[PDB]
Amino acid sequence: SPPLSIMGLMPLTKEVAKGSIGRGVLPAVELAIEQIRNESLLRPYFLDLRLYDTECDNAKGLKAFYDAIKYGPNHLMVFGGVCPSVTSIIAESLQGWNLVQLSFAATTPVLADKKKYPYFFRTVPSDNAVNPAILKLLKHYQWKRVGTLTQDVQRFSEVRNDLTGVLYGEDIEISDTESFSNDPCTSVKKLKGNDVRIILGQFDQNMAAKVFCCAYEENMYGSKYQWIIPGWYEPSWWEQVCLRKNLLAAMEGYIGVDFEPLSSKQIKTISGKTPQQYEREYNNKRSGVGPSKFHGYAYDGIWVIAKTLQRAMETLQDFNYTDHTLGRIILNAMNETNFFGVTGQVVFRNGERMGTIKFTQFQDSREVKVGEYNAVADTLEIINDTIRFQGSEPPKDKTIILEQLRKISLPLYSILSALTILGMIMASAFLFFNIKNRNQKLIKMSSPYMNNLIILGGMLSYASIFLFGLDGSFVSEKTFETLCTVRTWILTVGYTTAFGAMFAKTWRVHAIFKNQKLLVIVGGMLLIDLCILICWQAVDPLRRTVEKYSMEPDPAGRDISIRPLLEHCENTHMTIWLGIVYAYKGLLMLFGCFLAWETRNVSIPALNDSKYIGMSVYNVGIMCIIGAAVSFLTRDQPNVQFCIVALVIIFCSTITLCLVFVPKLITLRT
Amino acid sequence: HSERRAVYIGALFPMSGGWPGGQACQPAVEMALEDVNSRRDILPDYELKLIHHDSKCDPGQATKYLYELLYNDPIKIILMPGCSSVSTLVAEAARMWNLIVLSYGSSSPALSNRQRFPTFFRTHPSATLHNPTRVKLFEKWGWKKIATIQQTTEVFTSTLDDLEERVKEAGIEITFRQSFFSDPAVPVKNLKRQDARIIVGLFYETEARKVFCEVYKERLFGKKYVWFLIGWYADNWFKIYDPSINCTVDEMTEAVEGHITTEIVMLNPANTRSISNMTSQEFVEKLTKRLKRHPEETGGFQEAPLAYDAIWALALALNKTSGVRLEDFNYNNQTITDQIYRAMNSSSFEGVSGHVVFDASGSRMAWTLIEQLQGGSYKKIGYYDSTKDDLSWSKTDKWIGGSPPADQTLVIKTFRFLSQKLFISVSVLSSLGIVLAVVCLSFNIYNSHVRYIQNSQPNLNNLTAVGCSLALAAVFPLGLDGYHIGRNQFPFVCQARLWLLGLGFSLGYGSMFTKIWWVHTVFTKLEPWKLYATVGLLVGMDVLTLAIWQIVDPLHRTIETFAKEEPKEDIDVSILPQLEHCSSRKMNTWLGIFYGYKGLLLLLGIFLAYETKSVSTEKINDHRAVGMAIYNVAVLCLITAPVTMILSSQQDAAFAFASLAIVFSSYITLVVLFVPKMRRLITRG
Ligand SMILES: C[C@H](NC[C@H](O)CP(=O)(O)CC1CCCCC1)c1ccc(Cl)c(Cl)c1
Ligand SMILES: *[C@@H]1O[C@H](CO)[C@@H](O)[C@H](O)[C@H]1NC(C)=O
Ligand SMILES: *[C@@H]1O[C@H](CO)[C@@H](O)[C@H](O)[C@H]1NC(C)=O
Ligand SMILES: *[C@@H]1O[C@H](CO)[C@@H](O)[C@H](O)[C@H]1NC(C)=O
Ligand SMILES: *[C@@H]1O[C@H](CO)[C@@H](O)[C@H](O)[C@H]1NC(C)=O
Ligand SMILES: *[C@@H]1O[C@H](CO)[C@@H](O)[C@H](O)[C@H]1NC(C)=O
Ligand SMILES: *[C@@H]1O[C@H](CO)[C@@H](O)[C@H](O)[C@H]1NC(C)=O
Ligand SMILES: *[C@@H]1O[C@H](CO)[C@@H](O)[C@H](O)[C@H]1NC(C)=O
Ligand SMILES: *[C@@H]1O[C@H](CO)[C@@H](O)[C@H](O)[C@H]1NC(C)=O
């Protein structure tokens, strides 16, 4: 039997860490070789794999490759290479001896460059082959805001750059990128700071425990955050020595992404077996050695080799590494391989394998499979029963905020409106009583027009409260913006008349003690206030403004916050107008109070209501300054400030009308 | 002569690719071997020979040729690779064959790793040899914060990560670091945004001709910026046609004028004889006779001295090792390689390229030529040797402003003071006013028994004049500032002026208001103690108010700054003005209540003085003039109390208004309250 020799470069030693790969895939290579021998696929020839030990050291690997080229038989292909530096050294030089290499464990993206490595193939998916699977999982769950937490080593930088390259053209945007080096818990000011919910991690095992500890220290875990990290960590990797009780709690439900060792289907493969039969017979051969996750790819690799040598034979031996056309023939024969193996459909696209990507999820003790991606068909499928979320629904990409205008309590508004309408009909009853007994001499002992202006101002101060009370949710927008002016017109006119009449009476009593035109003074006061108000409306009309609070409190918890906003009627520089009118009213009010104190024990038959008008001036003063102070001080909650202003206005006006009119009725009727 | 047992050297000369050095380093090697074979002093028994292959600077081909060199007929004693990638491959592999690797053209910092390449040597210095030079300039010109825009090649990354450690040993800081692939728009725009002054640009020529077109577009050149580039570009790299850029050759010359470049000195700048009896000029002349093309279009011409010196260092190491036999070298014995290593390590001689000594890591130490682009042509402004740390300046660095720019713009905190002229004028007016006040007080106290100035409350007008004098005395420390006082004595001056002005106003207006108040209250329905106790209680409550102010929230110095203005004494200086006040944490809230209290008392006084205008009483007979005194005092105080606050800035106008109000109030008060009361006693008795 004329042999067909194949060069197998693997680390087979005992001390090298990756030797476990080269000792766990040999059962599968023996299975494939013995089955190709029994089946007699290559009938006249027979396949002979010569094993050489590249200890994953560049120098030892190049010496093993050189000693194989010199002191070895005529090799037709190279099979293997598990470490990336040695595989790169050999793959770049293959074209000088016309050898075609097929790897099964070299996953580094670098080798995908077909200008430097035009003779390299691999049956294992690349490291950046998980990016389309992530893209499909995102477009499957509508996640569009994703934050990447990479690490500054070469491999993760290539995966990250290919992620940047593949999300181009799609509606998925990357909000932020973090590139920590050795301590990952400084991303707190950036990941949380931009408030990202879907995190794409690319970092090695020893940093994953630190990330999932800093996420517990920051509370980046729970029903609202998703972690999508690599899945090729060793089982029970979270045993690195927040405690384990909290590290597990912060790890609950992270999604790991990796390549699928064996296809789950049950179609008869090219070997005449199904993946489960191959797994059973492999574990029967894998007696004492360790089980390596690469065994199915080595099986499919030997089968690709056999099919390629067969297809190259039927298109036609002394090969001596100087034959260019035979190497080109084998290269064209390996570029159109297409069959079904134990790892799925083996087919190459520009030398790279188009395999299946497994999605798994951490569920309470261990990672369970929850879905699979298929790159040749580019379809994701997810096992709905297996996947679980801590929330009732899958997390959302972006938290949003809802307005929820701050309203005032309607029943409190109704109660205060009922008290004010009661007070208004009481004031109208007092005005009708005064107009009825007009010609009685005792009512003639007080200027009746002044008391009628007092009662008119009291009823207007009682009627302004209906406009002042409105929240803004009971009326339309622009009608509200043209109503904050009428409330202040009516309030200032009512106050100016109701106070100017009693001020007129107190000043006149004081001026006639020391020794018609009594109403002209309030006419001039209303004239100056009307001028002030028309200038106010003319130069800066009361506009409508709105303010926002903390945005923090969420009572219902729809994962969307609420934005408590409050309405107001202001203008550009309303502080100067408020100061002007408040000073103009307060100084005059104090002046009236002083005149009332100086003229307290006076007795004038023409104006007999001298003392009680003074008491009314005192109470109006106190209540108005307290009301203005509380109105300016408690703008926070509109319910309490509206309640206080309503109570103080109703109390001031009712006490004024009581002290003025009640005794001139009790002593007159009886 | 007869034995002449040959010793073989395997070499890889790149005749093409990224760096075609073998086009001129291979003839230089051949010539060198002649000089080692024609001289009977070195290696007379042995003869050095050369097997060589064309590598093309592609490690994929160098791997096959390394197989051919290590697995063919004659046993090699040393390997001589060229460019850096091939050198990395060969220097990592040769550990297994017990071979010395002696590169002549590799500049990668990565090759200075003695753990990966335990037997590597090179006559081409590492690219990090520029970094000791750059730091030497940053200490010479005093710059202490630096920006570093680079291209993302690994050689440039290793160079800059060495530069960081080289500067942080000296205290200099790298404030900005940017990396780009082909288009530097974003990096240079971030440099313009961050306002970086000293820049270190590490990129190849094609990237440079784009970086500097974007620098001309962004105006990141000029009088205040300096660029530190690499020196091995072509001497006209900014004048050649290039369609990938948009800036005519008349520009792209203006963006580069005045930038410093460091390069390695390959040839000897002297004209002395080397260890081969040949000068640099005649070595160049002799090499030019071998090349079949001109040395302007041949590659690797600037590195041929390094190949010559590598051949000579190898010859001298073999001449020092050999009674070790070199004809019985085989790839398994590691002793002969240790002999050649220990003789190669301790190497020191004079070659065409200068003094040849290696580090502990096998990289050669050399000189650095520092030059500067001046008017479109490079000019040599100095040399530097890092081993003995000797910088030889030539005094030719033509800067734009005479002196080199600085690392950042300095800010000078300028204090503002009120013009001393106005201060001293108002102070002399207040001094004549206070002497008039004490004259009037003495006049009033002299005539205590005339009984006409006893019908006017005398002690109350004495207290009015005393308060007026205290206000006129407190005008003084109100004008003092940092021009005279200084920091330590500031709070005492402000507290003193506060207490004096407060007590002066309180006592004056209290003595004038108690009179108006009691005339009114007796008119509407008289005793000395009640009259004195009322003003005593008033000034005592004000004193307690000011004491609680002091105790709960003392007044202390506070500086408030303005918008930056260009002062123009230098084209690039910026100064920010500062105004010094005395203020508490919430002076405005605390002062507002006091000003309102006093304003209410003043308005009450105006009203009472107008109400009791024509009333006549004999126990106080001067209220008719005290009323017009109060009107003026109140009008001036209630109008210059808010103006002193609205014009808190522009200290000159604030002082003017406040102090003119005080002095005019004082003058008119004392005049209208004492001129008649003395004129009626020098014309009517
Ligand atoms: C001074 C230096 N001498 C040779 C250099 O060390 C060879 P090297 O170390 O192999 C780096 C090369 C390879 C890629 C393209 C140019 C640089 C050098 C550096 C850059 C350039 Cl463009 C030249 Cl021509 C020479
Ligand atoms: C080609 O093969 C023959 C026999 O296998 C061998 O003798 C010859 O050396 C080979 N060619 C080269 C260039 O080695
Ligand atoms: C490799 O095969 C693909 C189909 O699988 C084909 O489209 C491509 O042209 C082939 N490459 C060649 C012939 O170089
Ligand atoms: C969820 O997955 C199960 C099993 O794969 C499938 O039967 C079911 O149809 C899926 N749900 C939807 C809505 O497709
Ligand atoms: C070469 O070695 C011999 C023997 O030690 C020594 O005498 C001679 O000086 C050496 N030549 C040179 C140039 O150093
Ligand atoms: C280059 O400059 C020319 C000036 O005429 C302009 O028309 C052209 O659009 C520019 N192109 C680019 C790429 O800036
Ligand atoms: C070097 O060359 C000069 C030039 O003639 C000569 O004078 C000198 O003797 C030479 N030195 C030697 C050969 O050692
Ligand atoms: C290497 O050469 C030395 C020369 O002295 C000699 O010991 C032997 O040939 C080799 N060494 C070994 C240990 O084989
Ligand atoms: C290399 O030379 C240096 C300088 O003399 C010396 O300190 C060092 O020990 C030498 N290396 C060895 C391995 O002896």
Q: What is the CATH number of the domain that holds A21?
A: 3.40.50.2300
In CATH, the number for domain B423-554+586-679 is 1.20.1070.10
What's the structural domain count of chain A?
3
Q: A132: burial class by Cβ within 10 Å (0-12, 13-18, 19+)?
A: middle
Domain around A202:
128-259
Residues B400, B224: Cα–Cα separation, whole Å: 9
Helix, strand, coil shares of chain B, percent, nearest 5, are 45, 15, 35
Dig out the tokens for B14 from the structure.
């790149």
Residues B341, B313: Cα–Cα separation, whole Å: 12
Residue B64 and residue A60: Cβ atoms within 8 Å? no
- Residue A378 covered by a domain: no
Strands A198-201 and A401-402: unpaired
Dig out the tokens for A441 from the structure.
């001499």
Closest CA to B463 of B512, B500, B430, B528: B512
Residue A590, number of CB atoms within 10 A of its CB: 15
Give the CA-trace dihedral at A475, A478, A484, A485, to 10 degrees.
Answer: -140
Ligand 1 atom at shortest distance from the alpha carbon of B205: 22
Instruction: Identify from A85, A89, A179 which residue to disrupt to test chain B contact, counting B C-beta atoms within 10 A and taking the largest count.
Output: A89
* Distance from chain centroid for Cα B335: 56
Closest CA to B314 of B296, B340, B282: B340
With a 6 Å cutoff on the Cβ, whether B333 touches ligand 8 is yes
Residue B537: C-alpha distances to residues B399, B502, B519, B544, B676 (Å): 76, 15, 18, 10, 30
Strands A120-122 and A100-103: parallel
Dig out the tokens for B454 from the structure.
């006893």
Residue A59 and residue B89: Cβ atoms within 8 Å? no
Domain end, chosen from A335, A353, A371, is at: A353
Indicate whether A344 and A468 sit together in one domain. Answer: no
Where do the structural domains in chain B lie, given as residue ranges?
5-125+291-360, 423-554+586-679
Element (H, E) at A52: strand A46-53
Residues A160, A149: Cα–Cα separation, whole Å: 9
| CATH H superfamily, domain B5-125+291-360 | Response regulator (3.40.50.2300)
Residues A319, A99: Cα–Cα separation, whole Å: 10
* Distance from chain centroid for Cα A467: 41
**Do B383 and B368 meet the contact criterion of CB atoms below 8 Å apart?**
yes
- Residue A359 covered by a domain: no
What is the Å distance from ligand 5's center to B106 Cα? Answer: 29
**Ligand 2 pocket by Cβ (under 6 Å):** A 318, 320, 322
**A3-10, strands of its sheet edge to edge:** A46-53, A3-10, A75-80, A100-103, A120-122
Contacts of B101 in chain A (CB under 8 A): none
Residues B421, B427: Cα–Cα separation, whole Å: 10
CB nearest to B93's CB, from A59, A92, A96: A59
Indicate whether A157 and A114 sit together in one domain. Answer: no
- Residue A600 covered by a domain: yes
Does A444 contact chain B (CB < 8 Å)? no
Q: What is the DSSP letter of A403?
A: -
**Do B654 and B647 meet the contact criterion of CB atoms below 8 Å apart?**
yes
In angstroms, the separation between the Cα of residue A166 and the nearest Cα of chain B is 19
- Residue A94 covered by a domain: yes
Indicate whether A314 and A455 sit together in one domain. Answer: no
Indicate whether A118 and A166 sit together in one domain. Answer: no
With a 6 Å cutoff on the Cβ, whether B336 touches ligand 8 is yes
Q: What are phi and psi of A453, to 5 degrees?
A: -70, -35
Q: Which CATH number fits the domain that encloses residue A594?
A: 1.20.1070
Q: What is the DSSP letter of B364?
A: B
Residues A148, A134: Cα–Cα separation, whole Å: 12
Residues B283, B288: Cα–Cα separation, whole Å: 8
Which residues, including other chains, have CB under 8 Å from residue B413's CB and lie 6 or more apart? B575, B576, B578
Q: What is the DSSP letter of A2?
A: -
**B226-230, strands of its sheet edge to edge:** B173-180, B145-151, B198-200, B226-230, B260-264, B367-373, B378-385, B390-393
Contacts of B524 in chain A (CB under 8 A): 514, 598
Indicate whether A255 and A272 sit together in one domain. Answer: no
**Which of B321, B326, B328, B340 for mutating ligand 8's site (highest number of atoms within 8 Å of CB)?**
B328
Closest CA to B317 of B539, B79, B43, B583: B43
- Residue A478 covered by a domain: yes
Q: Which residue of B has its CA nearest to A594?
A: B604
Name the interface residues of B facing A (CB cutoff 8 Å): 59-61, 63-64, 67, 70-71, 89, 92-93, 95-97, 524, 600, 603-604, 607, 611
Strands A543-548 and A338-341: unpaired
Strands B76-80 and B5-12: parallel
Residues A271, A38: Cα–Cα separation, whole Å: 12
In angstroms, the separation between the Cα of residue A67 and the nearest Cα of chain B is 9
Which residues, including other chains, have CB under 8 Å from residue B564's CB and lie 6 or more apart? B411, B574, B575, B576
- Residue A375 covered by a domain: no
Closest CA to A343 of A295, A404, A405, A311: A295
- Residue A377 covered by a domain: no
- Residue A635 covered by a domain: yes
Indicate whether A512 and A601 sit together in one domain. Answer: yes
Indicate whether A342 and A276 sit together in one domain. Answer: yes
**Which of B318, B320, B326 for mutating ligand 5's site (highest number of atoms within 8 Å of CB)?**
B320
- How many residues are recorded in chain B? 685
Element (H, E) at A281: helix A275-285
- What is A555-613 written as a DSSP string? SS--SSEE--EEEEEE-TTHHHHHHHHHHHHHHHHHHHHHHHHHTSS---STT---HHH
Give, using CA atoms, the residue closest to atom 3 of ligand 1. Answer: B105
What is the Å distance from ligand 7's center to B290 Cα? Answer: 22
What is the Å distance from ligand 3's center to A336 Cα? Answer: 6
- What is A453-469 written as a DSSP string? HHHHHHHHHHHHHHHHH
Residue A594 and residue B604: Cβ atoms within 8 Å? yes
> Which residue is it, tokens 């290499």?
A101
Residues A289, A392: Cα–Cα separation, whole Å: 44
Closest CA to B303 of B82, B54, B79: B82
Indicate whether A238 and A193 sit together in one domain. Answer: yes
Indicate whether A135 and A179 sit together in one domain. Answer: yes
Indicate whether A542 and A660 sit together in one domain. Answer: yes
- List, in sequence order, every residue forming a beta bridge with B364; answer none if it has no partner: B358
What is the Å distance from ligand 9's center to B310 Cα? Answer: 19
Residue A548, number of CB atoms within 10 A of its CB: 11
Dig out the tokens for A278 from the structure.
């191959």
Which residues, including other chains, have CB under 8 Å from residue B32's CB and lie 6 or more apart? B307, B308, B311, B312
Residues A428, A434: Cα–Cα separation, whole Å: 10
Indicate whether A137 and A188 sit together in one domain. Answer: yes
With a 6 Å cutoff on the Cβ, whether A335 touches ligand 3 is yes
Indicate whether A478 and A587 sit together in one domain. Answer: yes
